[PDB]
Amino acid sequence: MEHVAFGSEDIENTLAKMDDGQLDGLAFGAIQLDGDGNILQYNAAEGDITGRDPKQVIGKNFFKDVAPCTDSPEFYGKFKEGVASGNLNTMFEYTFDYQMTPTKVKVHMKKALSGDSYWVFVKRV
């Protein structure tokens, strides 16, 4: 697999280089979202965790369509404050419970090195 640790101080630079095939080699789940919350990249691990087919969920909206349980102050709200502000670096625990067995995970949200995109990283706790 590709060699990146979850929570890494420099991780948005490491991932800048990665295409989707290479994203699927991470030991953790990775979503790339535009400033409107639309999914642009969605890695195999995230599929293993949540049970979605990444190919199919690219292009859908994370907060409206795919993961409405994250539509709340304590996830989306933090997401949008960061898009509003041009800056976003937060880590927290959450339970994913929409159309799946309830699964507690660690979420890390970080502004990408790209122009207007943001990362969401996920792993089991």
Side-chain angles (χ1 to χ4, degrees), residues 28-31 42-52 62 96 121-122:
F28 51 91
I31 309 141
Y42 194 112
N43 90 332
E46 189 52 21
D48 284 354
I49 294 168
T50 75
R52 279 81 177 166
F62 188 62
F96 281 167
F121 309 115
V122 186

Side-chain angles (χ1 to χ4, degrees), residues 13-102:
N13 312 50
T14 303
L15 283 223
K17 94 193 157 155
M18 290 193 182
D19 81 307
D20 70 3
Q22 259 201 132
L23 227 21
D24 288 329
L26 309 183
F28 51 91
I31 309 141
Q32 214 193 196
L33 254 66
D34 75 14
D36 286 297
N38 289 312
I39 297 147
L40 299 173
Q41 279 197 116
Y42 194 112
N43 90 332
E46 189 52 21
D48 284 354
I49 294 168
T50 75
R52 279 81 177 166
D53 193 302
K55 283 278 189 222
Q56 287 181 34
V57 275
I58 290 144
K60 285 172 196 202
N61 187 274
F62 188 62
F63 302 101
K64 181 173 173 211
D65 301 330
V66 193
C69 76
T70 65
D71 180 354
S72 70
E74 296 172 39
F75 195 135
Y76 190 23
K78 295 171 197 166
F79 175 72
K80 68 89 114 177
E81 316 204 10
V83 197
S85 314
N87 140 89
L88 175 58
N89 199 329
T90 181
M91 205 181 285
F92 53 97
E93 286 181 356
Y94 216 73
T95 300
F96 281 167
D97 73 349
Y98 183 69
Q99 299 192 156
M100 70 208 272
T101 309

